[PDB]
Structure formats: C-alpha cells, structure tokens
Design a protein around this ligand. Structure first.
Ligand SMILES: *[C@@H]1O[C@H](CO)[C@@H](O[C@@H]2O[C@H](CO)[C@@H](O)[C@H](O)[C@H]2NC(C)=O)[C@H](O)[C@H]1NC(C)=O
Ligand code: NAG
Ligand code: NAG
Lengths: 48, 48
C-alpha cells in the first residue's frame, strides 16, 4: 500500500493509533519483512 | 529546565494526549503504547 515515512512509526510493533487497529494489523506468527520503499518519479514513469 | 507531573488517584484518558499530537517515534521497555492506555497503575510520572 501507500504510506508516508512520517507514519513509519505508526506501523511499528505495539501502537494505540488508528492504522494498527483499523487498517493494517500485522501477523507476527510467520517470517515477515516490512519494507518501507520509495519509488522516484523517473522510475515510476516508464512502468506507469 | 523540564517539568515533571505525577498522577495518583485519578482515571486517565491517554487518548487525549495522543489524538492531539502525531507520533514520530516511540521507545518503550516492559510495556507498549497499546498497553499503556489500558493498564492500571499505582502512579504515572510524565516528564516532558
Ligand atoms: C523552570 O521550570 C519550573 C517548573 O517547570 C518553573 O517553575 C514555575 O514557575 C512559575 C512562574 O515562575 C510558577 O507559577 C510555578 O508555580 C513554578 N512551578 C514550580 C514547580 O516551581 C520555573 O519558572 C522555570 N524556570 C525558568 C527560568 O523558566
Ligand atoms: C531523471 O532523468 C533525467 C535524465 O533523462 C534527469 O535529467 C533528471 O534529473 C532525473 N530525475 C531526477 C529526479 O533526478
Ligand atoms: C502507461 O505507460 C505505458 C508506458 O509504456 C503506456 O504504454 C501506457 O499507455 C500508459 N497507460 C495509460 C496512458 O493509461
């Protein structure tokens, strides 16, 4: 999904904010990797 | 010169602090922000 890096602490383990309780609760029973990536405008113009 | 408050013998609504600010990073030991708003305490020391 799309989420700014200003809210990168909102998805962290244990939080009382609206993302981790209404939008995305992460299952930590399996091997996971949460990658906060960034796609610049040059790459995200040929693959549209 | 920072200030300290200790809250005893009262019921706290910690949502009032968190719905008024936006959190950039939290660092907790022995608790979580999800459990900081639900547990009952003998005292609550806040330094800001
Ligand atoms: C340093 O902080 C303390 C408290 O955080 C300030 O003390 C308060 O000062 C006001 C006005 O001088 C008083 O009305 C309060 O009752 C004081 N509170 C306490 C707990 O003493 C103090 O003024 C601050 N120092 C400076 C230089 O700003
Ligand atoms: C994208 O590539 C062009 C070269 O074709 C370059 O001039 C431009 O600065 C690049 N965009 C960014 C954000 O660096
Ligand atoms: C998205 O970009 C690609 C670039 O290869 C283009 O072929 C495609 O038509 C674009 N889609 C649009 C304009 O809806």
């Amino acid at each position: 999904f799309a989420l700014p890096l200003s809210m990168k602490s909102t998805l962290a383990i244990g939080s009382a904010e609206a993302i981790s309780m209404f939008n995305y609760n992460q299952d930590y029973s399996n091997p996971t990797c949460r990658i906060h990536a960034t796609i610049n405008s040059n790459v995200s113009s040929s693959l549209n | 010169n920072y200030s300290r408050r200790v809250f005893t013998n009262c019921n706290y609504n910690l949502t009032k602090l968190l719905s008024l600010v936006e959190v950039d990073e939290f660092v907790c030991d022995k608790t979580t922000p999800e459990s900081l708003a639900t547990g009952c305490y003998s005292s609550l020391v806040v330094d800001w």
